[PDB]
Amino acid sequence: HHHHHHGTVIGHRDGYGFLRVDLYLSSEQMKTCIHGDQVLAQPLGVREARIVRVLVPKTSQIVGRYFTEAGVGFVVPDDSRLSFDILIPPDQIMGARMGFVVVVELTQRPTRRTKAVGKIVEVLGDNMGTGMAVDIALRTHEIPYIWPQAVEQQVAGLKEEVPEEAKAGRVDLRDLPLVTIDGEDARDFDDAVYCEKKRGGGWRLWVAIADVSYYVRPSTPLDREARNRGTSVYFPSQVIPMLPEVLSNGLCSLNPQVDRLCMVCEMTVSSKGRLTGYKFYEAVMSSHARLTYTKVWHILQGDQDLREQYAPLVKHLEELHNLYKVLDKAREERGGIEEAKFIFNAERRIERIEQTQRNDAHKLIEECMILANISAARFVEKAKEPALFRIHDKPSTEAITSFRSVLAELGLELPGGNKPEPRDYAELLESVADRPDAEMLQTMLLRSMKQAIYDPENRGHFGLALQSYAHFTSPIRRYPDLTLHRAIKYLLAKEQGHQGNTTETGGYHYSMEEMLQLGQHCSMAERRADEATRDVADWLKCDFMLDQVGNVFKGVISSVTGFGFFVRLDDLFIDGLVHVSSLDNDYYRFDQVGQRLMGESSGQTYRLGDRVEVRVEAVNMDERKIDFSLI
Ligand SMILES: [Mg+2]
User: Fold this and answer.
1) How far is the CA of 275 from the centre of ligand 1 (A)?
2) Backbone phi, then psi, for 365, in 5-degree steps?
3) What range does the domain containing 601 cover?
4) Ligand 1 centroid to 256 CA: how many Å?
5) Are 444 and 456 part of one and the same domain?
């Protein structure tokens, strides 16, 4: 291995590529490499890399469109990072027609002297819409969506009601006024909340979680497919769930006024919002109400109709609000640190675009879940039990250096010395809030942050300013949370003197070697789901702008490159490119650290965060890209 690197090939539509381990792959090297290959590589000069061998080749389902040249069929990949055509012999056409979207299995990889060859294994057709975009995204990103037969068989024997035999031995919380608060369109209720004032100060908080590990035991078909998926995937009006709906919307979901098994984190909180204690136990509950964020917020604002309808719960909802206010302040004391809302028509296409409104009902659930997440992480960390922590690393030295150089030119500084802490960034964010360039500085700060991941090494969570954090409260839709419930049940039994590695209600002890693999896989699945949903969102946004060619929009420069700058349209969350060739004729200089394109003769300056107006010049539906002209 010295000195090799295992990495994944990332193609580029222009013929060259990259190795994700940042290494560059020449155009000639990419004649035998395929976007998605897993390889062993060696570094060269400047940083270029040479491929030693292909460890896991990319052969799986390639989505593209079918055409013919001189009677020879071929497929143009939909993902232009697969920057080659695929010949299809005439007996492997499966009855595809010109322009149809098809799915290909490679039979010959491309080489320097020959083109790739494949066979069409599925024909999707020419009816391009939201359903088609989802179908393409599932296949391109290899998201599992077909239920294995063994999963269907495992689930066939499930009763609709929890049997009394399952409730025996559990803490009875059915008289506790636990409630669920979720979006109107949600059907998989992972969590329920209740809190009381604590005698002498503070609060006692119950966070009750769907007891997924009771229903999904290790190595069963349900477990193997849940790990395979890694997470639920959320498309427009359509969920690809990690678990079959009979569990995720039924027995696991904490539905109203029905007895349900749950795993409970019961916590004490000080009058200043500090977690002072926690315990975990299996219980049975009965949700007193299925509420929405909108209803709860209106209740807290004083809405008469809702406070009459839910009068027996109003005091309990107000107490969660009181607790939240102090938890929010505790997050501030700790070190602290806008989204599109698609309105769809009946055909799952965008009718209009709104800005999501986030209110105290969203945030009180968020802070309650964070407390349970902290409690679960501290529980497994103190026990030295192999588990996935939800970690968020410090910003890179290079990102801090570039950020401080941008700040210094403005007379600003990032406090905290050479290794600033979350509170230092939060202090800087406060200081710049009212500046005209606050959005530019916030964007630069957030873009210096690393991406959060699942990892069995607890390196802390920078963004939340937490020493120990782990995802515990959504085991219906995240595989890491499922494994954490298993570890907690295993530890609870061990504290009672139990000596086995499993528990009759679903506990399980994992090895550190398993957890290393699981962290990489589950972090992969999280990113994979995000890229697929973004693909579909890109298609919907381009479809929405198709009839806007020629029209003018206000926007903000969202990224600057040597070939132009991208602009995000105000209130629409839609991006497009102002190419440098569309600007006034000049010699344009690119400042990378300043994120600036400067015209030498004109003195004109287009910088990240600048407010502009752009005209929609073109919408390319095949590439899902929009072209702008400035002014
Ligand atoms: Mg929920």
Assistant:
1) 21
2) -65, -45
3) 550-631
4) 13
5) no
